[PDB]
Amino acid sequence: GATRIQIALKYDEKNKQFAILIIQLSNLSALLQQQDQKVNIRVAVLPCSESTTCLFRTRPLDASDTLVFNEVFWVSMSYPALHQKTLRVDVCTTDRSHLEECLGGAQISLAEVCRSGERSTRWYNLLS
Numbered sequence: 001g002a003t004r005i006q007i008a009l010k011y012d013e014k015n016k017q018f019a020i021l022i023i024q025l026s027n028l029s030a031l032l033q034q035q036d037q038k039v040n041i042r043v044a045v046l047p048c049s050e051s052t053t054c055l056f057r058t059r060p061l062d063a064s065d066t067l068v069f070n071e072v073f074w075v076s077m078s079y080p081a082l083h084q085k086t087l088r089v090d091v092c093t094t095d096r097s098h099l100e101e102c103l104g105g106a107q108i109s110l111a112e113v114c115r116s117g118e119r120s121t122r123w124y125n126l127l128s
Contacts, residue, residue: 002125003031003104005041005089010119011082018045018075018082018113022058023121025067025091031103031128035063037093042102044088045075045110063093085110091126104128 008021022041032039038060048054056073090105104126113120 006123008121020073022069022071029065039063039093042090046086079115
């Protein structure tokens with residue numbers, strides 16, 4: 001009975017880059033009941049020593065119960081660096097006045113992301 005988000009993670013050891021694929025949102029009606037405005041996913045690889053490279057946001061999309069973003073984000077970083085990180089995701093919306101409000105999110109540990117490159121696809125509940 002919670003809004004869920006599916007995300008795929010992968011680390012490229014040889015090229016030293018981390019890939020974050022924001023796939024889709026499910027049951028968004030649980031948080032955004034007043035469906036009507038734009039929605040986007042705010043993503044952060046914390047701690048982030050520099051906003052330009054470890055803080056992202058997907059493109060805006062009209063609210064819907066099931067929403068597909070299929071947006072990928074990259075971060076050049078070492079494995080030891082990645083291994084200590086936390087991925088923070090939040091679903092936010094903007095009303096006609098340009099006011100933003102984040103309705104819920106989750107903190108995902110990245111300590112299980114494979115240095116060898118295997119891609120992990122999982123669902124996470126976004127709590128309010």
